[PDB]
Design a protein around this ligand. Sequence first.
Ligand SMILES: *[C@@H]1O[C@H](CO)[C@@H](O)[C@H](O)[C@H]1NC(C)=O
Lengths: 220, 209
Amino acid sequence: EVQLVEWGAGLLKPSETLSLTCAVYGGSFSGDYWWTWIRQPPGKGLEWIGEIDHTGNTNYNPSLKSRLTLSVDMSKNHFSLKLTSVTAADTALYFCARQEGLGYYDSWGQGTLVTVSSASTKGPSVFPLAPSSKSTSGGTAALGCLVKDYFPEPVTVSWNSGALTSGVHTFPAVLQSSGLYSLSSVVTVPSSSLGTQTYICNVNHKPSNTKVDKRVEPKS
Amino acid sequence: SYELTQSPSVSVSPGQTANITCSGDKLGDRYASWYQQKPAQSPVLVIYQDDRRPSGIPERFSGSNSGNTATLTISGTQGMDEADYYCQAWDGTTVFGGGTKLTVLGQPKAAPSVTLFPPSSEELQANKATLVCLISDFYPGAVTVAWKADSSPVKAGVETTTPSKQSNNKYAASSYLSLTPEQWKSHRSYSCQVTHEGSTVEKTVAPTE
Ligand SMILES: *[C@@H]1O[C@H](CO)[C@@H](O)[C@H](O)[C@H]1NC(C)=O
């Protein structure tokens, strides 16, 4: 095995070009090795990006072959990556790796996270999720608030200014392809209360200095 | 375009044998390798050249490539084997499978609760439409979510979280479907279908509600 050490700044804005490098200890840039980049979007699988040999032949994945250039500095046993016209969709953990003889990746770098700041500070839209009894236990209903398209984390959600805590489930946010977050908060309450008890979700997004108190009324 | 298929999730009881499989046309003509990946860590090669084990990989890991299926067999599965497992096939070109999450069961299985909300009238007035599919109290922490427009799988618009551990050691996840108001109002219904451990729960909402 060999030791692979990748560096590179991870934090980079979009539409641009990404650039990283990797260093190799205990090996040589000779023979049949293919020096490889593989990436992993958050929550997703491994995606082969491209390879380069010691002479400088390359193979790139057709999906981006037009936009990706690999290079090697044979003198210091380094290879490097350059990807053009990027997005938040290139956000991913990027690994360098060595492909050995019959097509297996014996040595991997630690990975470098390419978080792409495509978005800027943005406060959420808040929509009411009107009560439904279809999925809850007898005599109860679930209602909530959809907290849509904010950045960065975090948002906080209380109910009835914190008087209502029992039965609240605020779900971890999704990080969308747009680079913005959305989350939902739901509370299960007595069905008999719906005509007399007011339900308000208190949404606070400190990064944008935004507060929303959204009344969640039954719908008819 | 060449394709290796693996199931997204497998669970095994401690000490039992786990089989993780990967299929592809004429996979037997290609050399299969397997990688173990634990969270925020580099994949680790556990099998190469169909059935060879690197020095330092435990003997309970074995591999085979026959019948056009590559199989990673872990005998006497231990807690420490919980991880995502990727197959890879090489013929000169490299293809990875989609990964299998192996859960080594530490508690009994728990089936998900699914709540589906339609777009709110308020959001439709803002010329947008989001369906919200909330999934909770499930174990193993692995689900597949499929959305349907009437009965047809959607082509676009889905954002789904990875499962996260709840305070009670079960898991939660959420999935969102983004539509235009015209798409929402022009179908009879949309459905969120959640598959967990080979069982499926499908909830459905309709614009007339
Ligand atoms: C696992 O798969 C192998 C084939 O590769 C088979 O011989 C064995 O019986 C399987 N064992 C289990 C427990 O599924």
